[PDB]
Design an enzyme around this catalytic site. Structure first.
Site, short mmCIF file in Angstrom:
data_model
loop_
_atom_site.label_atom_id
_atom_site.label_comp_id
_atom_site.label_asym_id
_atom_site.label_seq_id
_atom_site.Cartn_x
_atom_site.Cartn_y
_atom_site.Cartn_z
N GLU A 35 0.82 -1.21 0.00
CA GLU A 35 0.00 0.00 0.00
C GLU A 35 0.85 1.26 0.00
OE1 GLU A 35 -3.08 0.44 -0.46
OE2 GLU A 35 -3.92 -1.57 -0.14
N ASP A 48 -12.70 9.03 -7.25
CA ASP A 48 -13.89 9.67 -6.71
C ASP A 48 -13.59 10.95 -5.94
OD1 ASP A 48 -12.74 8.70 -4.43
OD2 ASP A 48 -14.40 7.41 -3.85
N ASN A 59 -8.77 5.38 3.58
CA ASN A 59 -9.44 6.25 2.63
C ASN A 59 -10.37 7.25 3.31
OD1 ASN A 59 -12.02 6.58 0.68
ND2 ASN A 59 -10.12 6.59 -0.46
#
Length: 129
Positions: A35, A48, A59
């Site tokens: 990650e 988004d 997130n």
């Protein structure tokens, strides 16, 4: 802060992640490697408009507030900048919330695609834990 592999494993173990909800330590180290490359300051912007923060790329759509993801939630009740600290406490405490949410570690796309079903114990081999 850029962690070493074993340094991060020891920090995660101290914070209670080893076997947390059944996920052995190597799963968490593997997820962090892919990650964030073990970098607590990692940020990445999503399509988004949300942003992923920190060593576990948590997130802003759901988990932290960064003041620029409209209509989002802050389920960990923290500013997203808290997830970039050299102290991983906030990231770990939020990750425990995420992994308890029903989908387990599948919440981390890199874990699903690069750790799940692999020999994740390799990520903690050689470490004095």
């Amino acid at each position: 802060k850029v962690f070493g592999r074993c340094e991060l494993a020891a920090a995660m173990k101290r914070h209670g992640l080893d076997n947390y909800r059944g996920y052995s330590l190597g799963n968490w180290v593997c997820a962090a490697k892919f990650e964030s490359n073990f970098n607590t300051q990692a940020t990445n912007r999503n399509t988004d408009g949300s942003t992923d923060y920190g060593i576990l790329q948590i997130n802003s759509r759901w988990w932290c507030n960064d003041g620029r993801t409209p209509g989002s939630r802050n389920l960990c009740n923290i500013p997203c900048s808290a997830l970039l600290s050299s102290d991983i406490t906030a990231s770990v405490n939020c990750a425990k919330k995420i992994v308890s949410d029903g989908n387990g570690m599948n919440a981390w796309v890199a874990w699903r695609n690069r750790c799940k079903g692999t020999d994740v114990q390799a990520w903690i081999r050689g470490c004095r834990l």
